Amino acid sequence: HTLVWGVWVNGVDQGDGRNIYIRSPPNNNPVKNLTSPDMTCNVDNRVVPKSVPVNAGDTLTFEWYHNTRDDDIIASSHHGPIAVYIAPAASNGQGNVWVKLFEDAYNVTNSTWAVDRLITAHGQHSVVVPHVAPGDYLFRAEIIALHEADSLYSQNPIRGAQFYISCAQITINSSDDSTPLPAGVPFPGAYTDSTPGIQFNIYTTPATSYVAPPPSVWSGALGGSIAQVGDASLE
Ligand SMILES: *[C@@H]1O[C@H](CO)[C@@H](O)[C@H](O)[C@H]1NC(C)=O
Numbered sequence: 001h002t003l004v005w006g007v008w009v010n011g012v013d014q015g016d017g018r019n020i021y022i023r024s025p026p027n028n029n030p031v032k033n034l035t036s037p038d039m040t041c042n043v044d045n046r047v048v049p050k051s052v053p054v055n056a057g058d059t060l061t062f063e064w065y066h067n068t069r070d071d072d073i074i075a076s077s078h079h080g081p082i083a084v085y086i087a088p089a090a091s092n093g094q095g096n097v098w099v100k101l102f103e104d105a106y107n108v109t110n111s112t113w114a115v116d117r118l119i120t121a122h123g124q125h126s127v128v129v130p131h132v133a134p135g136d137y138l139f140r141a142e143i144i145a146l147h148e149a150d151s152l153y154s155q156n157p158i159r160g161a162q163f164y165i166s167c168a169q170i171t172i173n174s175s176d177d178s179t180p181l182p183a184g185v186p187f188p189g190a191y192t193d194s195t196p197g198i199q200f201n202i203y204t205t206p207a208t209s210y211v212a213p214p215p216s217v218w219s220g221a222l223g224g225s226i227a228q229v230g231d232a233s234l235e
């Protein structure tokens with residue numbers, strides 16, 4: 001159970017984004033139905049009033065929280081991967097529009113899932129804004145918690161992979177458009193019952209055999225990190 005509080009640009013807190021530039025759901029409950037429209041931007045997908053201005057090559061940091069800002073972030077049990085996608089805002093998340101910028105599942109060195117490192121990072125993970133056309137975009141941050149993913153939700157609705165989905169409204173002002181955005185995948189639709197990484201037993205299978213759901217990271221992505229970029233407690 002986790003939600004996004006807001007974003008930082010180049011290490012500067014943009015302020016409380018909930019229902020302002022984040023299409024916030026009413027609570028931190030997971031989405032589980034792979035075929036639901038809730039898979040796009042969670043249960044309350046509507047235009048919110050602000051869009052955060054960035055430039056190509058900026059560091060965009062998402063900040064997650066559980067109940068209050070800079071708390072335990074997410075229950076330790078919720079081991080799983082983190083991905084970020086982008087789509088043109090015009091689409092409203094509909095159609096074959098989502099392009100993946102970031103994937104982090106399991107770091108073999110540190111023996112930590114992306115979620116374990118997100119807790120240590122005080123809920124902060126970043127992407128570098130790609131060189132796409134100037135304009136209005138949705139950034140979709142997605143956490144998959146795998147602690148009950150041995151079962152499919154489609155067969156046992158008590159269990160299943162849990163999706164924590166947040167869409168931020170981002171405006172890209174300055175860009176050389178050297179990597180125009182290609183066509184992407186649909187949400188709902190990209191993940192099905194047979195997609196790798198949706199059904200997985202974290203208790204019995206070693207984390208090193210985990211494969212994150214496709215699609216793969218676009219070659220125009222400039223990377224990202226799970227790491228604290230600012231101290232929320234200095235505000
Ligand atoms: C999944 O959501 C779809 C689309 O709204 C709906 O048809 C179906 O009833 C849901 N499945 C379950 C298992 O609730």
Ligand SMILES: [Cu+2]
Pocket residue numbers: 001002075078
């Ligand atoms: Cu939870």
